[PDB]
Design a binder for these strands. Structure first.
Lengths: 79, 71, 162, 83, 82, 74, 90, 74
RNA sequence: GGAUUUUUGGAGCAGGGAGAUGGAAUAGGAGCUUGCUCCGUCCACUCCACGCAUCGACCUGGUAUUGCAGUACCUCCAGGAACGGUGC
């Protein structure tokens, strides 16, 4: 049995780039490197980028504090 | 204090309106802290839909009123 | 034993086989259907079988009334204000009644929501071209005497008496 | 700590019932597992949605978060549900 | 401090409640619980682009109520003292 | 670097010009003055931005956690 | 603990509205902005206000804007989206 | 209270999960959580045109989980 | 007792484009009635991109099953698509 909190801790220790999809919003997602987490699934992304699938654009913001109530799915990317 | 607002309408036919615009008219038998309504032999109007014993959750409830006398 | 508010408040009401709120008013021998305002349109069907009602009239405004059982009665005339009192009347069972002429079916044409009609075991059904006259006078009815109305019967009803 | 509709849903496990979701999906079948948080796990279930896409699956699991209503048979509405 | 104790002491008053779907129900507040379960008697409800309907009783939940409307002659300064 | 929890990151971001964007598309840019444990934000000299264009200045703006989608420290 | 967090956090921005009797604006999720003086507040942002003015815009379903005034009202903290404090009472 | 969901029988089984906004994924579950969070290793998501895209090990939260159908006989 | 399955809400808003197309009986403004011209609100038809694909309910014809049960729904073929929702 693999826990999701242990997988999030392994992804934060590996410092790999992960993409987070929003809830009830399939057009725009976020992508970045998760540095830390909390009990409320609050992600701290360094040099994050908002990717819009409809317009095919990417806007960088930097240090972003994403709440866990909006992130619906999180996948690991190689970029 | 007395908490007799839900006990006075027990075993009576009530029509509850949903959030999407549906109306379920059924005999309210029991409730809980989450406002879970159990409507035995309930009808769905928006057309008539034969449902019967429908256990609707309290999250999709908006308003409830008395429909008629108890059977 | 006329139909009053105390007889309607003491009558049994439950769910029928079609999951509709029906009140069983059989075994009362009511000579006239009246004092139906005590139900407050809380019943979807009316079971008035085995009665002595002579005219199907005197009913108040009931938007929830969709089925009316008038079987085993002596109904010989229909009221002209049936559409103003029951706009959602779709089921009308008038089997074994006292209807003799087709002219009593002329106030029945005002019910636009009526789709199921039963006129079996009646002297009006034994007349010539009774089904064609019922199809021509009431085009909204789809099932007449447990029979589906076809296009050929509608064409035969629209051809004659046009 | 346990509600009376929750106890009625737990006592109706093993009967042919249906659960209509908030999106309109109706999972129908035998209620194999019914927890206190309206978690309905059914085996040999059938999907009849408001979309109408009727299919048959071996196992289905619908949580209580997106569950709108539940249609149960009237075999348990007489006793011991009479209070 | 707690708004539930202030809302529970507003019984026998003709108020109005506007929901999130645009339906406004005006009536006399008769029962208020800890979960803001508003039980009113002889209320009038007007939905979005619909006709107003009068009911002898109504029960609205606390999560479905968006805003409230109190009369101008309501003693809000005296009812705020716990 | 070291794994930082979001609560000291929100405590240390006070007094710096950040921008909090909500789920409705609008963002408020200003200096973060108050941040409690319930993820509530209170800023001073806030400016509203909608669709990449500035709307106007409001001053002290209070945004709850149920509507705020993200926050970026500028 | 609770009083210090209410007088030192974001709720102090509400507490400056009831102590000094200032006017603040509340933008809701129904595209309506109500400007008024906050009279009573709570931990769940239950705002009971007096002498409020609510402005919005409506379509015939060109559209047009509109406004209205209420003597005393009460709004729950769930529908409150934005709360802005500005020196508008002076 | 805080009872975990009955996911012991669906362990290491290929199931299809539905997420909000009309999302569909298929993969093998690798664990359980009391907050209804599921870890799907070697997951494949269905696009709008119908093509399947492999996203690898993903984590789905319980706030957007609609329905999980087991494609294998348990 | 406002941080994922119930009660302090992730809700709000808008229905593709064109055509010397057609109508506001009593309800638009301006060129300061009436007639005409212009512009930010629908429905009916036609054209491109019957908006698209899906399944359920449903109508016509042909066709198969004569079977004792407590039910999401029940034969198949072809045409038409009045309805529902799903993703773009």
């Amino acid at each position: 049995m693999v826990q999701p909190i242990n997988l999030i801790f392994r992804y934060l220790q590996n410092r790999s780039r992960i993409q987070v999809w929003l809830y009830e919003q399939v057009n725009m997602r976020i992508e970045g490197c998760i540095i830390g987490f909390d009990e409320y699934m609050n992600l701290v992304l360094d040099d994050a980028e908002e990717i819009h699938s409809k317009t095919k654009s990417r806007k960088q913001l930097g240090r972003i504090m994403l709440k866990g109530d909006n992130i619906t799915l999180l996948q690991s990317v190689s970029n | 204090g007395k908490s007799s607002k839900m006990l006075q309408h027990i075993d009576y036919r009530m029509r509850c309106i949903l959030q999407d615009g549906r109306i379920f008219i059924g005999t309210f038998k029991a409730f809980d802290k989450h406002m879970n309504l159990i409507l035995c032999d309930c009808d769905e109007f928006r057309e008539k839909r034969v449902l019967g014993l429908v256990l609707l959750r309290g999250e999709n409830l908006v308003s409830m009123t008395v429909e008629g006398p108890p059977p | 034993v006329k139909l009053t508010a105390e007889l309607i408040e003491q009558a049994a009401q439950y769910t029928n086989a079609v999951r509709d709120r029906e009140l069983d008013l059989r075994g009362y021998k009511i000579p006239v259907i009246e004092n139906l305002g005590a139900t407050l349109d809380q019943f979807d069907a009316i079971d008035f079988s085995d009665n002595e009602i002579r005219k199907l009239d005197g009913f108040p405004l009931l938007r929830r009334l969709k089925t009316l059982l008038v079987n085993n009665n002596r109904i010989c005339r229909i009221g002209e204000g049936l559409d103003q009192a029951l706009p959602c009347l779709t089921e009308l069972i008038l089997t074994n009644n006292s209807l003799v002429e087709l002219g009593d079916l002329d106030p029945l044409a005002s019910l636009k929501s009526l789709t199921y009609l039963s006129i079996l075991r009646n002297p009006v059904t034994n007349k010539k071209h009774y089904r064609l006259y019922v199809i021509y006078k009431v085009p909204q009815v789809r099932v007449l005497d447990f029979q589906k109305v076809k296009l050929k019967e509608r064409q035969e009803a629209e051809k004659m008496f046009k | 700590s346990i509600g009376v509709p929750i106890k009625v849903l737990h006592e109706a496990e093993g009967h042919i019932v249906t659960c209509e979701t908030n999106t309109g999906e109706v999972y129908r079948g035998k209620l194999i597992e019914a927890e206190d948080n309206m978690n309905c796990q059914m085996s040999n279930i059938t999907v009849t949605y408001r979309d109408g896409r009727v299919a048959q699956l071996e196992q289905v699991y619908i949580r209580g978060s997106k569950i709108r209503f539940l249609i149960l048979p009237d075999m348990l509405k007489n006793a011991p549900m009479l209070k | 401090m707690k708004l539930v104790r202030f809302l529970m002491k507003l019984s026998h008053e003709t108020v109005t409640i506007e929901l999130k779907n645009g339906t406004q129900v005006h009536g006399t507040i008769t029962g208020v619980d800890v979960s803001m379960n508003t039980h009113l008697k002889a209320v009038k409800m007007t939905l979005k682009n619909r006709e107003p309907v009068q009911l002898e009783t109504l029960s609205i939940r606390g999560n479905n109520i968006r805003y409230f409307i109190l009369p101008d002659s309501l003693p809000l300064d005296t009812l705020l003292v716990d | 670097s070291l794994p930082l929890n979001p609560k000291p990151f929100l405590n240390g971001l006070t007094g710096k010009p950040v921008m909090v964007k909500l789920k409705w598309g609008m963002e408020y840019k200003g200096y973060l003055v108050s941040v409690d444990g319930y993820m509530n934000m209170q800023l001073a000299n806030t400016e509203e931005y909608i669709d990449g264009a500035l709307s106007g200045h409001l001053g002290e703006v209070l945004i709850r956690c149920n509507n705020v989608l993200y926050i970026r420290g500028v | 603990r609770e009083e210090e967090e209410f007088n030192t956090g974001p709720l102090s921005v509400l507490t400056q509205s009831v102590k000094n009797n200032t006017q603040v604006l509340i933008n809701c999720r129904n595209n309506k902005k109500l400007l008024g003086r906050v009279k009573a507040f709570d931990r769940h942002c239950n705002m009971v206000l007096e002498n409020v003015k609510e402005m919005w815009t409506e379509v015939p379903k060109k559209p047009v804007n509109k406004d209205r005034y209420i003597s005393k009202m009460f709004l729950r903290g769930d529908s409150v989206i934005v709360v802005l404090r500005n020196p508008l009472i002076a | 209270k805080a009872h975990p969901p009955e996911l012991k029988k669906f362990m290491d089984k290929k199931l299809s999960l539905k997420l909000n906004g009309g999302r569909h994924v298929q993969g093998i579950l690798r664990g359980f959580d009391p907050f209804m969070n599921l870890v799907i290793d070697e997951c494949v998501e269905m696009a709008t045109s119908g093509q399947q895209n492999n996203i690898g090990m993903v984590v789905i939260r319980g706030n957007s989980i609609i329905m999980l159908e087991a494609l294998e006989r348990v």
